[PDB]
Each structure stands twice: as structure tokens, then as C-alpha cells.
Amino acid sequence: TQVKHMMQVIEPQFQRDFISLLPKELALYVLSFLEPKDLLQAAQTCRYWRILAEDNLLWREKCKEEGIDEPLHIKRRKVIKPGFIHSPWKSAYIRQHRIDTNWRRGELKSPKVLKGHDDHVITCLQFCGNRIVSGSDDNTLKVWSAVTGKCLRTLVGHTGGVWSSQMRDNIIISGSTDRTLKVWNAETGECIHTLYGHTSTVRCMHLHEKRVVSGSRDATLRVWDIETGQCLHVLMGHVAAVRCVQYDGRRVVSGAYDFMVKVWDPETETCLHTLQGHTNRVYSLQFDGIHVVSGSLDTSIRVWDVETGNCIHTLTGHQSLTSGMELKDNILVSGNADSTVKIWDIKTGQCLQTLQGPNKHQSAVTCLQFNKNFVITSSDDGTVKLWDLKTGEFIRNLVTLESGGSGGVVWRIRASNTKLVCAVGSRNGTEETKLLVLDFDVDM
């Protein structure tokens, strides 16, 4: 069907070639052994071939290859003569290829500039399907539209600076120096809960479903219910400030300025493990339910087994503070003040790549994002760079602040498959604080 329907309407007759003569099915079995790059060339051979190469099911399986899961059903209208039944899975595959190509060597379209948080800093950034939330030490948060540019709402309520944030379609959560957390309604921008319990600055927080865990400078963590607004548990055991936290709904993992990483079972407010090894403050964490990954001011990154508390790998090589890390499928990427970024396999402990070279960052890496093709890094050098994850090679500078060398800095970045959001500013007055939104979507 569909391919049959095409043969009997276009009528491509008399072909003196191998595949045009083979029973439809066997031609398809054959074409399946080709890679997309080939199917696309083969499709330009002749009308008969083109029709075959468009077999919807040949691509549905080629999309599972690149992990698409969703075919796109495109643009209607007044047909060009001899019709053609396009394959949704094929166009879906091509869309992604063009998007990847747009990021890689596209052509930077000037980004939407979103001015806000004047003469202040952006401490946290959140990006969730069309909505952007910026957090600042000016005591506010602003919900933006990644689509238009406009500020939709400004969450005023905190009496201290905002330093932590989390979000899940319409539910925003903030953590302030005013010692409280606040649950907001992104659409109406109204505060719906104010959580008291912490006595010192609310430094970090991780949200999982209907619960959120916060880490504070009071050396404790609190687990709250985003709906009721109640505090469910209090994790006490840390001696110094809790800088980072991860929560998967089963265990709470935390890193504090006491060089310790603690694994908790919230329900019973009990510390199951205290992970010892780092010789200085632990700033960053990542947790996949099996491995806890910690980054310290001590230069190392440790990989631990959550179940035994046993250290599995001590990843060495960085030279300064590992500020940010991202874990995914046992692949870890770390951003470091030594201006380097590293890609590791936390199963073997191998350091797959170090992102440096002639176009490496000039100062500390402030943030990073990554997927199966690229690594995106931001820095105080005023640039956001795009790197090839597989080769570890530099690709290009997505952003290059003119004031980069004199104050301009990119504090944070959030990337979707189709766009990049950057938090920009400066301590002196060379760069007005704002968000930059780059669009890498394709016309289809």
C-alpha cells in the first residue's frame, strides 16, 4: 500500500535496472541495508526509485535509529501536478538533520534580546517548552516567552535575592536569601505557598514530581509538598552549607561545604550514607538512581555507588573548581573553572574528551548543555561555544559578546532541540543584563 498506490498513479514504466524488476518487497529488503545518507541519493536516481525510497516503514525504523519517536505531518495545499505521497517519518528524519546542520554551521540569526534585571545578576535559569524563567538577586523572577520575546510576568514577593529555581509546566519554585522558598503559578504569576523552615539562605533545590528538596546554608535540607505547601521532612547531619542537591523520589543526595556527600531516605529522615573522599567543598552533583557523581573545589570528581556508599572512580584531570556537571546514560560532562570541559564514561572511568584547543574558553566555564551530538558551553569570556561530542573538536562560537573581554559574561544556558537561551550580563556596566534566545529551527 501507499507505495503501490504511487506506482499505479504516476506509472513509471520500462526500467532496465536491478531493483525496478525485483518484487516490491525484496527491493525494500535491499534498500533497508542502506544508511539514510544513501537512501537520499538513491531517491534521486529515478521516479521509480524515489517512490520506493519513500516507503514510510523504511524510515520509521531509521528514525528509531536517531531516536525520533515522532513523525511530522506537514504543510498542506494546492499541489504541484503529479502528486507524491510523502513519508511523515522521512520528513521527520530530514527535519532533525537540518536542525542539527543549523546548529553546526547554520548561520547565526540575530537572537531575540530580552532586557531585564537591570544592573543585577541572573542566578538561575529554567527553560520548559516555550516558557523561560530567570532568577535574580534583584529579588525577582521573570517568566518569559521563548517564542515572542516578551516578559509575561514578574514574580515579586521575596525580600532577599533569588538563588535557586525549579519548574515543571506552570509550577515555578524559588529559593531566596530571605530564607524561604516560594511556589508560584507561572501563568497568573501569583504566589501560592511560602515555605518556612530554613533559617539561612536557600542555596539549592531539586524537584521531582509533587515534591521538592531544598539545601540551605543552615546545613540542612527540607522536603516539601508543592501542592499542600507543607514541609514533610528535615534532613539534619551536615556540618556546613549544603551547596547542591539531587532527588529522584527514592533517595536524596546532597553535597555540602563539609567535603561530604550524604545519601538520604527522606521518609525516615535518615542518613543512609555519608560519602567521604573529597578533600574540600563539594559544589556539584548528579544522580541517576544508581550512581551519585560529585564535583569538588578539590579538583576531583567522584563517582559513587548509591547502594553501598563505595567510591567507584576518582576522576582526576581538572585543575580547578568543577562548577557544573551533566549526567546522562553514564556519560558525564563537566565544566571547570580551569576553562576546560571534559567528557567521561562513568562506567569505565575513561576521560573520552577534553574540550580545549586554539578555540578553548579563556576563563572559567560557567555552564553547559549536551546531547548525543554536541556539547554547548558558556563562559566569562563572553562566548557560548558549540563542540562535537564524538570528536571533542571545536565547531564554532554561537555567541560572542563584544564586551566579552571587558566584563561581558554568559552566566547560564538552557538548550532545547530547537533553541538556545543565554543569561548575559556583567559586574561592571559593560553589559546590560538580559537573556539571549537563539533559534535553530528549520522551515518545514
Binding site: 546554608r217 580547578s320 562548577s323 573553572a337 572559567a364 560557567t366 559574561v409
Partner: peptide
């Protein structure tokens, strides 16, 4: 602290 990184000012 490396330039480009932040923390709230000390409270007490």
C-alpha cells in the same frame, strides 16, 4: 572565586 561564578553575599 573564579570570575563568572557566584554565591549570595554572606548573611552573618
Amino acid at each position: 572565586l573564579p570570575s563568572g561564578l557566584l554565591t549570595p553575599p554572606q548573611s552573618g
